[PDB]
Amino acid sequence: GRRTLSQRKGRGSIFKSRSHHKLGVAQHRAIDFFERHSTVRGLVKSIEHDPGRGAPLARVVFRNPRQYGLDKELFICAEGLYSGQYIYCGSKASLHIGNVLPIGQCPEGTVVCNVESKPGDRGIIARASGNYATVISHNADNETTRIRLPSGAKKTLKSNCRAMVGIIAGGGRTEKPILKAGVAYRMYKAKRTTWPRVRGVAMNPVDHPHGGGNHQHVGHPTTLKRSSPPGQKAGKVAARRTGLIR
RNA sequence: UAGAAGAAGUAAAUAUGUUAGGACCCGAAAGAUGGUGAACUAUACUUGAACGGAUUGAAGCCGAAGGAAACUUUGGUGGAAGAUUCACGCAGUGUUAACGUGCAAAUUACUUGUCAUAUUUGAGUAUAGGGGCGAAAGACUCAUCGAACUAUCUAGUAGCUGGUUCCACCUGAAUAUUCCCUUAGGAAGGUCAAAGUAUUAAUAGUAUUGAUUGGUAAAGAUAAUGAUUAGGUGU
RNA sequence: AUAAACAUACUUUGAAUCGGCCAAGUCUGGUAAGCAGGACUGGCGAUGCGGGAUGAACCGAACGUCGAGAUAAAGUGCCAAA
RNA sequence: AAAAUGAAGACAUUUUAACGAGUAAGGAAACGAAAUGGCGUAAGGACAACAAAAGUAGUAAAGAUUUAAAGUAAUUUAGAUUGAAACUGUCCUUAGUGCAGAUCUUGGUGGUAGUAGCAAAUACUAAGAAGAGGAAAAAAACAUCUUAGAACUGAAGAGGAGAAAGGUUCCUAAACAACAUUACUUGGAUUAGGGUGAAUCGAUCCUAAAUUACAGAUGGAAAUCCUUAAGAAAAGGAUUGAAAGGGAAUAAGAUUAAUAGUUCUUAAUCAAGAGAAAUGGUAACAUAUCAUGAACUUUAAAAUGGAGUGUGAAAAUCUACGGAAGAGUUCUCUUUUCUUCUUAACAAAAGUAAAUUCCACUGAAAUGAAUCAAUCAGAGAAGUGGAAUUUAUUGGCUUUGUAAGAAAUUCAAUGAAUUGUGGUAUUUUUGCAGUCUUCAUAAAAAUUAAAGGGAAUCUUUUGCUCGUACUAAUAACCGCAACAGGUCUCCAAGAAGCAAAAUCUUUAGUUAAAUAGAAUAACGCAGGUAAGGGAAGUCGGCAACAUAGCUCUGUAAGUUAGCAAGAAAGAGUAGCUCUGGUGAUUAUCGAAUCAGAACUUUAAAGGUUAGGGGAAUCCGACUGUUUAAUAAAAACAUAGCAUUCUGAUAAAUCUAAAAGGUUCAUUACAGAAUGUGAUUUCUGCCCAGUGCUCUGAAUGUCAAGGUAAUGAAAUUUACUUAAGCGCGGGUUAACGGCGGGAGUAUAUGACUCUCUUAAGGUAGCCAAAUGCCUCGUCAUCUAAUUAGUGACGCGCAUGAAUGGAUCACCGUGAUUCCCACUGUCCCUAUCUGCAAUCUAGUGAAACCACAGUCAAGGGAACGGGCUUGAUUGGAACGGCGGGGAAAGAAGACCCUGUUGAGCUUGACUCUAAUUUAUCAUGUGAAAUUUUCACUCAUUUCGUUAAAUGUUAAAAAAACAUUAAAUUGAAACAGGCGAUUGAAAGAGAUAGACGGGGAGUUUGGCUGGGGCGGCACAUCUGUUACAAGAUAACGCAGGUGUCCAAAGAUGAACUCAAUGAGGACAGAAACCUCAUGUAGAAUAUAAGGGUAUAAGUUCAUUUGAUUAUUGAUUCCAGUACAAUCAAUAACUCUGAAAUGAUGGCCUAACGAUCCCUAAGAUUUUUAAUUAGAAAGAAUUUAAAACAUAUUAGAUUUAUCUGAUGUGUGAGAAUUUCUAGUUAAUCCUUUAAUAAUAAGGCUUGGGGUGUCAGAAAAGUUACCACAGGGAUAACUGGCUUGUGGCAGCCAAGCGCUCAUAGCGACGUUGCUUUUUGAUCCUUCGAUGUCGGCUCUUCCUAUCCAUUUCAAGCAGAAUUGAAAAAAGGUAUGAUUGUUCACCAUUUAAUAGGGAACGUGAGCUGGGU
RNA sequence: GACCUUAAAGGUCACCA
């Protein structure tokens, strides 16, 4: 046989990210004393559209708590932010939309976004459009707090992990139905090469495990073990269930 | 059942036979190893270039009239759409036209379709052979692709096909038998040739006389086993 | 009884060969076959010559180069010798 | 062969006799009576004038051409001519030693053949010049240049220029041997010269996608990774990457045979250099340098998509008024028609614009302002007055300097003349303004300026390196070339029109671009027309005809309500003369557009351009893509729908490895893996099987390890270990699946019974692109329907995200029917151009054993050659497609190879990735090794390693720095800050999983292969032919066993059946007598054998045993197996002779290696006792240390010297008899021991393909070596079957066997069906039907002539002569065939390689 | 027709040309 399309994706030749017009890395600012024990105030200069992602980006400008100059940051917009707004980052920040607070200071039930899975790693969870994470409970014995991830899973993080209060802007993006093949083509302008997807049953036995015979069909069960080698791992992987959900 | 029984062997040059090597000469599709290719084509990115004329008329907006209201009727304006068409171009539906030792190792003529957003296109750049790339035809990867090109292993192997070079003279065949992964082929054996011997209980594809063997042709059918048409006599 | 001394008995080494085919006062399967397969012998293969007009197998007869005669199968109206 | 002779003769002796064919094959050399005889090629060693100049040769070698001679032949010899320097004969030796073939290799050359051709791109003609090169009885044509005529490209060009590529092709002169399919005086061709000028155009500079270094990391290696992260490297990050991106600065005229934003004249610009620090304006803001402005920081520019509308300006075109100069027309007119009337870079500022944004005064409602559209206003409209920016350089346009001195148009013979002003017109270019659109937001750096801050106190010089010629294509580039193919751009006139369309023309370019002339045949290619009919042609309206612009009227069903729709359908349209509407400015001026009216004619879109329309069915929703070179589609994509996994140190996944890489500059509205394919309606039941999974169970099965026991030890044994499987549950929008039979209300069967699945196919749909039967049944379409449509449904074998049903719009998709139109057709005629024909010049190729008249025969079963006939005159031109089983190609179909390759799978054997367990020693603790606590290796991260730890002390989009006065601005820790953490990663070993991947295999026989069978090891009878052998996928059957008795022996008895008797008792129970040759039994298939037995019964027993020989059956006289004959033991039975080494006989079975059992003690040795008999033993140089005894040292398992003796020494040993002890089948190679292992002999474990590999498929994507050893087609033999014909006569025919038929039987012919065979063809004979056309047969359908009848006439029926002439048109189907509707005198049947493909078609296959 | 099964009846095969 040949090497299937999923195998050719891992080499990254034509499947490299189309990130040329992107604004940059969107994250919190690097942790320091002034964020651990004080608050630094930033100014939302503008709100910009980052190619390839559905949420807007804010060009915040903190000043320089230790030197002279400007610290041009690049945050992910929370819904409701506006140009010229002031936002405060630090442990003593007020509980307002757009402010950055350690996850331990947020009252149980607070909605946050752009949460750090580890202290000081500048944002991991709840970064897509309209997404958010909820603080479940605190644990002052070992300085851990429980949050509910947007997928529904519960995760325990350190109580000093930072997060931004609010909802990532641009929600309800995927509810608008794409209508045309051309529109879907334009969606991957600043993404990887994946769109026009040929069914495995339409390929040939050399190309794909599904490449069939005189009738377009699979032939063998499409639920496979997690341990299948790359090359035959095509279809549902480690499927605990199948069929329409009730 | 090997041996001994007053030793025969050895050396070298040829000829013939067996055997290994390119192996009488030429012939595979294949396999492995190392390199060269994206000047053709495939996809993707960077930076450039290229929409002229018509058709239809969506939101949005304005007037008039009707209405308690909700709003409706009517006339305009507007210029959307992977909307309809023509042109520069492009493709290749049909003639299964031309040509078919061509203009051309895929072109020409008319007809047909298409002719800016999933568009067309230049340069740069990236992806390499059990790999790439593929809106998927096993398609494309320099006229080479159901695994490119190039060189080495390599004069690859062939029970299969083709060829195999002077004269006279003498002798002159085979298709049984056994075994084989055997059936287009081999070894044992038969037929044949050439060398070399032995005075030789070592002649016969013949007939006769004598003693035998066998169960074929024929013959038989209340002679045994069967098959089958009738007629008398007795109970 | 007849024949047999270039009789007889061989020994060694080795070549090619084991695709066969035909005839019949023969046989088996088949309706049958210029079909398929066998017993015995003679042939073609390996083979020309004379005759059957022509023909791998039929009939006579097998071959160094020639001359003369008697012949064989078979023929004798012309082609064609009688 | 035998005799005779035999040192040398010679002819390989003399004589006599017999013999002589031959494919494959053999006979090497030498051998005197020669164990075959010789010829030739080349080289090596000798010999070649015997008397001291010793083979031939310039008095002509080798070679070549021939003429003759010798030899059976291979070959040799000699002469003649040519040739001019080496060569030959004999003997041995040696070998790169003899050619007709290999689709042989290389080179050369023929026929074809003066043949096919030298035919796209409209086109040339006259006069003259130059030249050898238009002559001549028309030799009808003539290359280059100039002039004139006539033309084409038609300004998206056949024009003027660039990028790439080419590389001197550029310009000129001389010259034409070759080349540009004739020629050339021409040339992009030959020869020789000349030619490319930059401070301003580019490269150079910057960075994009990307690329590459030192050090570092990885690797066995080559090398790979990393690109600023790891670095004592680089205020911050290295190299390269654009002649289309960014970018300091030049223009006009003139000049050269050719270079020019490059030279010259004139006129400019740019960069680098040289000679307590300003005013004005209310404000927006403004001032020939002015008017200081460091570090540091920020902002902006360079630098940002597309569409569409409006509009400013310039240019081009057109036009209004006024002219000046020149040109054209002019016997008909034309105050006429045409040309010229221009201006740069850089700067200036008389005059004067459009649009946008801001500033000041004021404060809008009765709301206003404005655009084509919009849009805006108390965070302030409108108004008035101002400021700024943009508009191809200063400042947009006119104007000005440059500058008229240039340039253009004229005139004179260098010198003179002129060079106004406009437009509410079109196009192009370039800006501007707002509007729309994106799940698309549409680059960076070099480089420049400004600001915040307040540190410090005009002239002139120079401008380097490299490119610069030319083409840029119907001749300079890539395709072998001057190739009708391909290749990126800039500039762009008139007519007409909606139009950059078609058509014609101006400026420019060219008239040649693979040759022409004559004639005007066939057959063609390209373009046409056609009476009457109108698809009747055909697989099919293929091809062609037909519709075609604009205006007005009108427009259906269906529908996703958007469409259908340009639906369909109808009318108008010309020319000329007029009339009216639509404005600007304030009476004058201007625009093409619309409407209307008289009149005339050839009655009007049509020169060119320019939709045929309608009714339905299927598939796909749509726009899109696709097999470059036979498939453009129903296939792929698509939006929509659905499922699975993943919290990122993850999922997927590349890599040998890696602080390695991709999605990821990412974070579940995300990433990755799949199925279905818009919308509507709906997705039924099944978890048994195979997958997937579980948050699940332990003590079923499971490895290396770990622990323990025995033993001298290896070894062995036991216990305990993870995943995996098993056990239990879940899951089908996971792979997939979704039944039978019988009664029952003139038929059907609601109903009932019964069998048993995991579930029994549900809603739907249907002879469907899915239905064999089948051309299903009923309607409809037609005259006629294997076609279409609508219905029916026990549906071979429909059916629900393998998606079911439904269709609106859409489609170079498949199918049917109507209208219109027509040469598709009846049925062909005719016209034009280019060829073909002939000629001058020029000039190939495929192919070719030799060749070329027929019939029949035979033959390899279809001859051009052979045999017998028919017949023949030599050379051929134009056509032609019958033949040459014509050419092209080692058949691609089929088969065979112990030949492959792609693909698939629990085929066999493995393997990367995944996974589980153990080992690989961080500290300090607890529980029964586990659980904890820590960090210290380790992992994953973050930053400018920027306040770690412990003490101490949401009103405002603005600024924040270089400090004033060691502090100000606190100290210390041996932790840059977090995170994980002794667990996880990488290594080793072990178990599981693993078509993701690698290697390989897939028996044989065979009336072709496959399916079927086993004729493959094997027995009986028969074919089988009276010895032995012996065929078929011949016939009838049989084996892979069974038996402690069914082996051995002894004894007794006689069986099957029948008759006659005997209570129940009978046809069959048990008893008796008689007859009883086996008709019973003997394990089994069949055939043999058997009567005081080989059968039945009784009794004893284990010979169904050990060892050794010799034979017989298959046989190769191998093995296995079997069948016998003896011998030596120990036994069984019998009184005994005998019998017994399995079964009454013919089948009942098995190598090498490997595993596993049994046996090798009968005998031979050593030592020591007692007895006896023979026995001299070889001869000088010495160290191992067993040690004692001393001289030193030492404490530890204590060693280190030297003195010393024996050892170890040499001037007994064997045999034998009787004991005793011990050992005893051989070996593990220095000697022994107990374990272990290996030998030797004999059995068992098995190969059934049975003389014995370890082995699944599919190729319609296929490949190679071959095959007529072998199938699919013709032909040939046969004729079962198909067709036709006879003989007899039981009967039918109202009576009557034979008018006409003829049963039960029986004899033939034919090759028009299909069989049966495999003879020819596998380095190829083109395989169905139809169309066209010719011929042949008669077994005759019609016409002609006759006979018969159950023939009155008519219509008919049977038969004879006769094959000269006729034998049709359509619907459906690819059909042959068939079935319908017609018509006719009849609408007969057949052959010719199932006639006919260099004759067509391509419907089917 | 061939193979299989039941108490005649069914079931699978019938292929490359």
Coordinates of C-alpha atoms (C1' of nucleotides) in Angstrom, one line a residue, chain D residues 760-1076:
Chain D
rG760 C1' -37.7 -12.7 11.1
rG761 C1' -37.4 -7.0 5.6
rU762 C1' -40.9 -2.3 9.1
rA763 C1' -42.5 2.7 6.6
rG764 C1' -42.0 2.9 1.9
rC765 C1' -40.7 1.7 -3.6
rC766 C1' -40.7 -1.5 -8.0
rA767 C1' -40.2 -6.1 -14.3
rA768 C1' -36.5 0.4 -11.9
rA769 C1' -29.2 1.7 -14.5
rU770 C1' -32.0 -3.4 -9.3
rG771 C1' -37.1 -9.2 -12.1
rC772 C1' -34.1 -15.4 -14.1
rC773 C1' -38.8 -16.9 -15.9
rU774 C1' -39.7 -12.3 -19.4
rC775 C1' -40.8 -9.7 -25.3
rG776 C1' -44.4 -10.6 -17.1
rU777 C1' -50.3 -9.0 -16.9
rC778 C1' -53.7 -4.7 -17.7
rA779 C1' -54.2 0.3 -20.0
rU780 C1' -51.9 4.4 -23.2
rC781 C1' -48.8 6.1 -27.1
rU782 C1' -48.7 3.9 -33.2
rA783 C1' -51.8 1.5 -39.0
rA784 C1' -48.3 -1.8 -36.6
rU785 C1' -44.5 -1.0 -30.2
rU786 C1' -38.7 -6.8 -27.3
rA787 C1' -39.0 0.7 -27.1
rG788 C1' -41.6 4.9 -23.5
rU789 C1' -45.2 6.1 -19.8
rG790 C1' -49.3 4.9 -15.9
rA791 C1' -50.7 0.9 -12.9
rC792 C1' -50.4 -4.7 -10.3
rG793 C1' -46.8 -7.3 -7.2
rC794 C1' -44.9 -14.1 -2.7
rG795 C1' -39.9 -9.0 -5.3
rC796 C1' -34.4 -15.4 -8.8
rA797 C1' -31.7 -11.4 -5.6
rU798 C1' -35.6 -3.8 -3.5
rG799 C1' -35.7 -1.3 1.1
rA800 C1' -34.3 2.7 5.0
rA801 C1' -27.0 7.9 6.8
rU802 C1' -24.0 0.7 2.1
rG803 C1' -29.3 5.8 3.5
rG804 C1' -35.7 4.9 1.9
rA805 C1' -39.4 8.1 -0.6
rU806 C1' -39.9 12.6 -2.9
rC807 C1' -37.9 16.8 -7.6
rA808 C1' -38.8 22.5 -7.9
rC809 C1' -34.4 25.3 -10.4
rC810 C1' -29.9 23.4 -12.7
rG811 C1' -26.9 19.5 -16.6
rU812 C1' -21.7 19.9 -23.8
rG813 C1' -25.5 13.3 -18.5
rA814 C1' -29.0 8.6 -20.1
rU815 C1' -34.3 7.6 -22.5
rU816 C1' -39.3 8.2 -25.2
rC817 C1' -42.9 11.2 -27.9
rC818 C1' -44.9 15.7 -30.6
rC819 C1' -44.4 20.7 -33.9
rA820 C1' -41.1 23.0 -37.3
rC821 C1' -37.3 22.1 -40.8
rU822 C1' -34.6 19.8 -44.1
rG823 C1' -30.6 15.3 -49.7
rU824 C1' -30.8 11.4 -43.7
rC825 C1' -34.1 8.8 -47.6
rC826 C1' -37.5 7.8 -52.2
rC827 C1' -33.0 8.7 -56.0
rU828 C1' -29.7 11.1 -57.4
rA829 C1' -28.5 15.6 -60.4
rU830 C1' -25.4 19.7 -60.5
rC831 C1' -21.7 24.3 -59.1
rU832 C1' -17.0 26.2 -57.1
rG833 C1' -11.7 26.0 -54.8
rC834 C1' -7.6 22.6 -53.6
rA835 C1' -5.7 18.0 -55.1
rA836 C1' -5.6 13.6 -58.2
rU837 C1' -4.1 13.4 -64.4
rC838 C1' 0.3 15.3 -67.9
rU839 C1' 4.9 18.1 -67.9
rA840 C1' 10.0 21.2 -66.1
rG841 C1' 13.0 21.0 -61.6
rU842 C1' 13.4 18.0 -57.0
rG843 C1' 12.4 13.5 -54.7
rA844 C1' 11.6 9.6 -50.0
rA845 C1' 9.3 5.3 -47.1
rA846 C1' 6.7 0.6 -45.4
rC847 C1' 7.6 -4.0 -47.5
rC848 C1' 10.6 -7.9 -50.3
rA849 C1' 12.7 -16.8 -49.6
rC850 C1' 11.9 -16.9 -55.3
rA851 C1' 7.9 -15.1 -57.5
rG852 C1' 3.2 -13.9 -59.6
rU853 C1' -3.4 -16.8 -65.0
rC854 C1' -7.3 -20.7 -63.5
rA855 C1' -10.4 -25.7 -62.2
rA856 C1' -10.1 -30.3 -59.8
rG857 C1' -7.1 -33.9 -57.1
rG858 C1' -4.0 -35.3 -53.4
rG859 C1' -1.2 -33.0 -49.4
rA860 C1' -0.4 -30.5 -42.6
rA861 C1' -7.8 -32.0 -44.1
rC862 C1' -8.4 -23.8 -48.1
rG863 C1' -1.5 -24.2 -53.7
rG864 C1' 1.7 -19.4 -57.3
rG865 C1' 5.0 -23.8 -57.8
rC866 C1' 3.3 -30.8 -57.4
rU867 C1' -0.3 -34.2 -60.9
rU868 C1' -4.2 -34.0 -64.8
rG869 C1' -6.5 -30.6 -67.7
rA870 C1' -8.3 -25.2 -69.3
rU871 C1' -5.5 -21.7 -71.6
rU872 C1' -1.0 -17.9 -72.5
rG873 C1' 2.1 -11.6 -77.1
rG874 C1' 6.5 -8.5 -75.2
rA875 C1' 6.3 -3.7 -72.4
rA876 C1' 2.8 -1.1 -69.5
rC877 C1' -0.7 4.0 -68.0
rG878 C1' -5.3 5.5 -65.0
rG879 C1' -8.4 3.2 -61.5
rC880 C1' -9.6 -0.8 -58.1
rG881 C1' -10.0 -3.0 -53.4
rG882 C1' -11.2 -10.1 -54.8
rG883 C1' -6.5 -12.5 -53.5
rG884 C1' -1.1 -12.5 -52.0
rA885 C1' -4.6 -17.2 -45.5
rA886 C1' -1.0 -8.5 -47.6
rA887 C1' 1.8 -4.9 -43.8
rG888 C1' 2.1 -3.1 -38.6
rA889 C1' 3.5 -6.3 -33.2
rA890 C1' 8.3 -13.1 -30.2
rG891 C1' -1.2 -13.1 -29.1
rA892 C1' -3.1 -8.7 -24.7
rC893 C1' -7.8 -14.2 -25.0
rC894 C1' -6.7 -19.7 -23.1
rC895 C1' -3.1 -23.1 -21.2
rU896 C1' 1.8 -24.7 -19.5
rG897 C1' 6.3 -22.7 -16.4
rU898 C1' 8.0 -25.7 -9.6
rU899 C1' 8.8 -17.3 -14.0
rG900 C1' 7.0 -12.8 -11.5
rA901 C1' 4.5 -8.2 -9.7
rG902 C1' 0.2 -4.9 -7.6
rC903 C1' -3.6 -5.8 -4.0
rU904 C1' -6.4 -8.8 0.2
rU905 C1' -6.9 -11.9 4.4
rG906 C1' -6.1 -15.5 11.9
rA907 C1' -2.5 -18.4 4.4
rC908 C1' 2.9 -19.7 6.7
rU909 C1' 7.2 -17.2 9.0
rC910 C1' 8.5 -12.5 10.9
rU911 C1' 8.7 -7.0 11.9
rA912 C1' 8.4 -1.0 13.1
rA913 C1' 4.7 1.5 16.2
rU914 C1' 1.5 0.4 20.8
rU915 C1' 1.3 -2.2 25.4
rU916 C1' 2.5 -5.1 30.3
rA917 C1' 6.3 -7.2 34.1
rU918 C1' 11.4 -7.3 36.1
rC919 C1' 16.5 -4.9 36.5
rA920 C1' 19.1 -0.6 36.3
rU921 C1' 20.7 1.6 44.7
rG922 C1' 18.1 9.6 46.1
rU923 C1' 17.0 10.6 51.6
rG924 C1' 13.8 9.9 56.5
rA925 C1' 10.1 7.2 58.2
rA926 C1' 5.5 3.5 59.1
rA927 C1' 2.1 -1.1 57.5
rU928 C1' 2.0 -5.8 56.5
rU929 C1' 7.0 -5.5 50.0
rU930 C1' 3.0 -1.7 50.6
rU931 C1' 1.6 3.2 52.3
rC932 C1' 3.6 7.8 53.5
rA933 C1' 6.9 12.8 54.0
rC934 C1' 10.9 15.4 51.5
rU935 C1' 14.3 17.0 47.1
rC936 C1' 18.7 15.9 45.2
rA937 C1' 19.0 13.6 40.4
rU938 C1' 14.7 13.7 36.3
rU939 C1' 10.6 15.6 33.5
rU940 C1' 7.5 19.9 31.5
rC941 C1' 7.7 25.1 31.6
rG942 C1' 8.9 31.5 32.1
rU943 C1' 11.3 35.6 31.7
rU944 C1' 15.2 41.7 30.4
rA945 C1' 16.9 34.3 34.9
rA946 C1' 13.8 42.0 37.3
rA947 C1' 12.0 41.8 44.6
rU948 C1' 11.8 33.9 45.9
rG949 C1' 12.0 32.9 51.3
rU950 C1' 12.7 34.8 56.3
rU951 C1' 13.3 39.0 59.5
rA952 C1' 13.0 44.2 59.6
rA953 C1' 10.0 49.1 58.6
rA954 C1' -13.1 50.2 38.0
rA955 C1' -15.4 58.2 36.9
rA956 C1' -10.9 60.8 32.5
rA957 C1' -7.6 56.6 25.5
rA958 C1' -2.6 62.3 29.3
rC959 C1' 2.9 62.5 31.8
rA960 C1' 6.2 59.3 34.2
rU961 C1' 13.8 58.3 32.1
rU962 C1' 19.4 60.7 32.2
rA963 C1' 17.4 62.5 40.9
rA964 C1' 17.6 66.5 44.4
rA965 C1' 19.4 66.6 49.2
rU966 C1' 26.9 55.6 51.5
rU967 C1' 21.9 56.5 52.2
rG968 C1' 18.0 58.5 49.7
rA969 C1' 16.1 53.2 46.9
rA970 C1' 16.4 48.1 54.5
rA971 C1' 19.2 43.3 55.7
rC972 C1' 20.5 38.0 55.2
rA973 C1' 20.0 32.7 52.7
rG974 C1' 25.2 29.2 49.8
rG975 C1' 17.6 27.8 46.0
rC976 C1' 16.9 32.3 39.0
rG977 C1' 11.1 31.3 39.7
rA978 C1' 7.7 27.7 39.4
rU979 C1' 6.2 22.1 38.1
rU980 C1' 6.7 16.8 38.4
rG981 C1' 9.5 13.7 41.2
rA982 C1' 12.0 8.7 43.0
rA983 C1' 7.3 7.7 39.9
rA984 C1' 7.4 8.9 34.7
rG985 C1' 10.8 8.9 30.0
rA986 C1' 15.3 6.4 27.0
rG987 C1' 18.1 1.0 27.5
rA988 C1' 18.1 -4.7 28.2
rU989 C1' 15.2 -9.2 28.8
rA990 C1' 10.3 -11.5 28.7
rG991 C1' 4.6 -12.0 27.4
rA992 C1' 0.5 -9.8 24.3
rC993 C1' -0.9 -7.3 20.1
rG994 C1' 0.4 -5.8 15.4
rG995 C1' -1.4 -7.0 6.6
rG996 C1' 0.7 -0.5 9.1
rG997 C1' 5.0 -3.4 6.6
rA998 C1' 8.6 -7.4 4.6
rG999 C1' 9.6 -12.5 2.5
rU1000 C1' 7.1 -16.6 0.3
rU1001 C1' 3.5 -20.5 -1.1
rU1002 C1' -1.1 -21.6 -3.0
rG1003 C1' 0.2 -30.6 -5.4
rG1004 C1' -0.8 -33.8 -9.6
rC1005 C1' -3.9 -36.6 -13.1
rU1006 C1' -7.3 -34.2 -16.5
rG1007 C1' -10.9 -36.0 -24.4
rG1008 C1' -8.5 -27.4 -23.0
rG1009 C1' -8.5 -25.2 -17.8
rG1010 C1' -12.2 -24.7 -13.7
rC1011 C1' -16.3 -27.4 -10.9
rG1012 C1' -16.9 -32.8 -10.3
rG1013 C1' -14.0 -37.5 -9.4
rC1014 C1' -9.1 -40.2 -7.6
rA1015 C1' -8.2 -44.1 -12.4
rC1016 C1' -2.1 -40.9 -6.8
rA1017 C1' -0.6 -46.3 -1.9
rU1018 C1' -3.5 -50.4 -2.6
rC1019 C1' -7.2 -56.1 -3.4
rU1020 C1' -11.0 -59.4 -6.2
rG1021 C1' -13.7 -60.7 -10.8
rU1022 C1' -14.0 -59.0 -16.1
rU1023 C1' -12.2 -56.3 -20.7
rA1024 C1' -7.5 -59.7 -21.5
rC1025 C1' -6.2 -62.1 -26.6
rA1026 C1' -5.8 -70.9 -23.0
rA1027 C1' 3.0 -68.9 -20.9
rG1028 C1' 4.8 -63.9 -18.8
rA1029 C1' 3.5 -58.8 -19.4
rU1030 C1' -0.7 -55.9 -20.3
rA1031 C1' -4.6 -49.4 -21.9
rA1032 C1' -8.7 -45.9 -21.2
rC1033 C1' -12.0 -40.2 -16.1
rG1034 C1' -13.5 -49.1 -19.2
rC1035 C1' -17.3 -52.2 -16.1
rA1036 C1' -19.1 -54.6 -10.9
rG1037 C1' -17.1 -53.9 -6.0
rG1038 C1' -13.2 -53.3 -1.8
rU1039 C1' -8.8 -51.3 2.4
rG1040 C1' -6.7 -47.6 6.1
rU1041 C1' -10.0 -52.5 10.0
rC1042 C1' -11.2 -56.8 13.4
rC1043 C1' -9.4 -60.9 16.9
rA1044 C1' -6.7 -63.7 24.6
rA1045 C1' -9.5 -65.8 20.7
rA1046 C1' -11.6 -65.3 15.7
rG1047 C1' -3.6 -67.7 17.4
rA1048 C1' -1.5 -73.3 18.5
rU1049 C1' -2.9 -78.3 19.4
rG1050 C1' -5.9 -82.8 20.8
rA1051 C1' -10.6 -85.1 20.7
rA1052 C1' -15.8 -85.6 19.5
rC1053 C1' -19.4 -84.3 15.9
rU1054 C1' -21.6 -82.9 10.7
rC1055 C1' -23.8 -78.6 7.9
rA1056 C1' -28.3 -75.8 4.5
rA1057 C1' -32.7 -77.7 3.2
rU1058 C1' -36.7 -81.6 2.8
rG1059 C1' -40.1 -85.5 4.2
rA1060 C1' -42.6 -88.0 8.3
rG1061 C1' -44.0 -88.1 13.4
rG1062 C1' -44.8 -85.8 18.9
rA1063 C1' -49.9 -81.9 24.7
rC1064 C1' -50.6 -76.8 24.7
rA1065 C1' -47.6 -75.9 19.7
rG1066 C1' -50.2 -73.0 15.0
rA1067 C1' -46.4 -71.4 8.7
rA1068 C1' -42.1 -70.1 12.6
rA1069 C1' -40.4 -72.3 19.8
rC1070 C1' -38.4 -77.9 21.6
rC1071 C1' -37.7 -83.5 20.7
rU1072 C1' -37.0 -88.1 17.1
rC1073 C1' -36.0 -90.9 12.5
rA1074 C1' -34.8 -90.8 7.4
rU1075 C1' -32.6 -88.3 2.8
rG1076 C1' -29.0 -84.9 2.5

